[PDB]
Ligand binder design. Structure first.
Ligand SMILES: *[C@@](=O)([C]S[C][C][C][C][C][C][C][C])C(F)(F)F
Length: 530
């Protein structure tokens, strides 16, 4: 019932739990991977862990990083919220735990960089850990805590991404203790999580922390956000303003923030949440700064152009109807109204802050005319968001990568319309196809919503998909290929783009993109190099 293991900084006691079927795994949750960013540490890079004595309780996840969840609703059930959220959770096939190795999976959770967690409410390791692999999830600093940017020495920006690097390093040292191979770590993420993963993959400061990666609906340059420096300044100076600060010196603004109570910050960020919908702060291209681990030293797009991350083989995913999943919140913020008021919302934040005055204008035009003929309306935006924020970015990445003489790349389109869909349930949705985050649910067990359901062996259609999806994930992390028959799901070829169409459990098929998809590509290409 109580399992014990040693880690570099001390002993920890996890729990022996059940995976699908009879399978069992040791599970250590809430383990600290660094000093908690609590005082003068709130926004600064994570400090090393003072060692501890006795056995650290790694029975369950710890609290969740300060945030305001404008999306998950009851799907996520945090055991509390605190700035002392920097913990990871490690799950391992019981038989594999050393007592004097396995491939490991590090997962970065989505939530627009502003909310979410690495908890098992949404991230159940049950399916995965049933495939002979170690699963590692964790929390990183969110919204203002992890992405504030003062282009200063104390807050150069990207603290959130640094937390990931800190944890990937912690994994390198501690992998063996769990019976895992640090030489075979696979990084995965979805949404902001996937975008962060892609970004790390371009960071020379993350070299050697993982052998390959999985991008589930997210990329370093996906349009749903921006790494633009001007924008950072804007939103930041807009926060400090709204928050009552008046100081101007980078450091002084900092101190005031350091001494500000959590709640005052949470309210001030929830202010921006109202203004932008589902995100607030973001990663930024940073300037070199004194004694600073530069996570991002350039525009992702230009970095990629020079093959800056082409040696990390990866799986690039995206769903059928990505943004159908957001309808409920699109209404709450009333995007239709917002669009009428800000016709630039249709334009990638990255272009608005980069392109030239007349340029923007014309694009702003083009975009509007493109999805809104008779009237600015919901479905029109949902189309926009899906293509622009997910589908386009994914395919454009598959293509660009396949023609840079780099590592392999596998592209997929999740279109499976499950019998049971947690997110449509919680939000009362109704649409065809697969919306954003759903493929993630056939790889992780949504423990906060399932019951005592048994998924493996599969019997219903849905569990069969669970089996198939989690198999692509473990094969990749085992053989750097999502399939055991190289021809069932071929690497991406530039001369012939095709994606594995995930739709029916146990049926392979790489197909070309539909007409619209091709049209969307061209359209979006012309727009991006206008
Ligand atoms: C995921 O991390 C994707 S983040 C997408 C945020 C922008 C969506 C459009 C907002 C328009 C107002 C997750 F879904 F957040 F988890």
């Amino acid at each position: 019932e109580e399992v014990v293991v040693r880690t570099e900084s001390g002993w920890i006691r996890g729990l022996k739990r059940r995976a699908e079927g009879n399978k069992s795994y040791a599970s250590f949750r809430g383990v600290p991977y660094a000093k908690q960013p609590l005082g003068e540490l709130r926004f600064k890079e994570l400090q090393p862990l003072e060692p501890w004595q006795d056995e650290l309780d790694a029975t369950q996840e710890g609290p969740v990083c300060q945030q305001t969840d404008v999306l998950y609703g009851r799907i996520m059930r945090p055991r509390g919220m605190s700035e002392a959220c920097i913990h990871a959770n490690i799950h391992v096939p019981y038989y594999a735990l050393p007592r004097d190795g396995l491939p490991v999976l590090v997962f970065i959770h989505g939530g627009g960089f502003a909310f979410g967690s690495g908890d098992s409410d949404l991230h159940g390791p049950e399916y995965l850990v049933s495939k002979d692999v170690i699963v590692i999830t964790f929390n990183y600093r969110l919204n203002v805590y992890g992405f504030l940017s003062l282009n200063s020495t104390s807050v150069p920006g990207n603290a959130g991404l640094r937390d990931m690097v800190t944890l990937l390093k912690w994994v390198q040292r501690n992998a063996h203790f769990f019976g895992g191979r640090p030489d075979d770590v696979t990084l995965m993420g979805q949404s902001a999580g996937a975008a962060a993963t892609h970004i790390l993959s371009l960071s020379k400061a993350a070299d050697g922390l993982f052998r390959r990666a999985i991008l589930m609906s997210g990329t370093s340059s996906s349009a749903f956000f921006t790494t633009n420096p001007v924008f950072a300044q804007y939103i930041n100076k807009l926060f400090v303003t709204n928050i009552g600060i008046t100081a101007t010196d980078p450091e002084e603004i900092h101190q005031k923030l350091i001494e500000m109570p959590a709640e005052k910050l949470n309210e001030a960020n929830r202010f921006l949440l109202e203004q932008f919908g589902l995100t607030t702060f973001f990663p930024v291209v940073e300037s070199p700064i004194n004694g600073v681990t530069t996570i991002l030293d350039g525009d992702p797009e230009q970095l990629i152009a020079k093959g800056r991350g082409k040696h990390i083989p990866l799986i690039i995913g995206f769903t059928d109807a990505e943004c159908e999943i957001f309808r409920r919140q699109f209404e709450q913020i009333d995007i239709v109204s917002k669009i009428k008021e800000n016709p630039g919302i249709l334009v990638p934040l990255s272009v608005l802050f980069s392109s030239a005055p007349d340029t923007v204008a014309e694009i702003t035009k083009a975009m509007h005319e493109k999805y809104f003929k008779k009237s600015v309306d919901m479905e029109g935006y949902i189309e926009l968001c899906t293509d622009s924020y997910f589908m386009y970015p994914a395919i454009s990445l598959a293509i660009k990568r396949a023609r840079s003489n780099g590592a392999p790349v596998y592209l997929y389109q999740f279109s499976f319309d499950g019998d049971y869909s947690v997110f449509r349930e919680v939000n009362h949705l109704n649409f065809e196809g697969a919306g954003h985050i759903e493929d993630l649910t056939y790889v992780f067990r949504t423990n906060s919503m399932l019951g005592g359901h048994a998924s493996f062996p599969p019997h219903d259609k849905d569990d069969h998909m669970k089996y198939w999806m989690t198999s692509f994930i473990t094969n990749f992390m085992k053989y750097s290929n999502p399939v055991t028959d190289a021809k069932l799901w071929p690497e991406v070829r530039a001369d012939n783009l095709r994606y594995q169409d995930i739709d029916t459990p146990d049926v392979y098929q790489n197909v070309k993109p539909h007409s619209e998809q091709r049209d969307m590509l061209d359209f979006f290409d012309s727009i991006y190099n206008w």
